[PDB]
């Protein structure tokens with residue numbers, strides 16, 4: 080019963096809301112949904128362990144300084160989303176990564192790079208360009224379409240696996256300090 | 265510039281005293297007033313062998329510094345017959361210019377199985393201590409440890 084706070088960031092119009100709705104409700108934008116979108120708590124099973132995902136779509140909140148600070152401090156893992164038909168959204172990615180790193184004052188924040196709208200033929204960002212960026216950061220890259228649901232679960236589940244690796248590493252370090260920090264004089 | 269600042273700090277830096285107490289009872293087991301921190305000459309220290317039976321010891325270092333330091337800290341390497349037995353990192357933090365400060369560190373004993381007898385340790389232990397201000401090396405000094 081562990082809660083993972085996952086925060087979806089990226090430029091306006093990249094599909095952050097579409098991706099979140101597709102994860103939560105198993106369907107693409109269809110019928111009218113008057114729901115104010117902020118955070119949502121969803122129970123899922125990843126690799127046989129039940130957990131709660133607290134998923135924040137930042138589309139509304141990113142414009143407000145105190146809200147940005149708060150979600151970057153509280154978020155455990157970050158989906159950094161661009162659209163494969165919008166080179167500007169891809170160029171914006173490093174700004175989001177650097178902001179998150181500064182706010183958390185840490186160099187290994189769990190993150191996954193997501194190239195959304197991969198159902199579209201008019202691509203301006205190559206898979207290889209995106210892979211290279213992700214390799215340079217040491218993080219996974221996943222191509223998604225919120226429209227077809229391709230890669231949506233994979234994107235969020237991969238991020239949870241990145242958070243678990245981070246948390247398992249911190250618990251081994253804490254044990255390793257306890258053992259190392261005793262003297263024979 | 266960094267070379268000049270390290271020289272300035274060491275010039276204004278003085279180790280006034282040090283002692284070791286049993287952590288549980290607070291009784292002073294050993295006291296030194298020698299500047300065991302001087303870089304040039306290997307220093308000797310003769311500490312009572314009962315120190316090895318303490319569950320933990322409290323070490324207090326009292327020092328003065330004319331120069332301000334942001335992140336005053338220590339690295340200690342403990343060598344047994346020339347082999348690195350242990351490595352320790354201690355941080356003091358911000359040193360006020362022209363201040364005199366007492367720095368307390370708690371050192372807990374390893375399990376009884378891993379403890380080494382005074383008869384094996386005595387004369388074979390060298391403690392190399394490096395004093396830093398952030399990443400700037402101020403001095404290196406060495407003490408040869410006897411258990412009597």
Ligand SMILES: Nc1nc2c(ncn2[C@@H]2O[C@H](COP(=O)(O)OP(=O)(O)O)[C@@H](O)[C@H]2O)c(=O)[nH]1
Pocket residue numbers: 089090091092093094095096097098108138195196197198199223224225226227
């Ligand atoms: N073709 C296609 N369109 C998408 C996809 N995801 C989102 N969109 C559309 O892109 C627009 C912006 O999506 P939205 O989720 O509002 O983006 P946000 O501003 O990042 O939350 C909307 O018109 C969506 O229908 C996708 O995977 N494929």
Ligand SMILES: *C/C=C(\C)CC/C=C(\C)CCC=C(C)C
Pocket residue numbers: 262263264282300301309315321323325371391393405407409
């Ligand atoms: C448990 C045994 C210890 C901590 C050995 C005592 C160490 C010294 C005496 C030398 C310490 C030297 C400096 C603080 C410069």
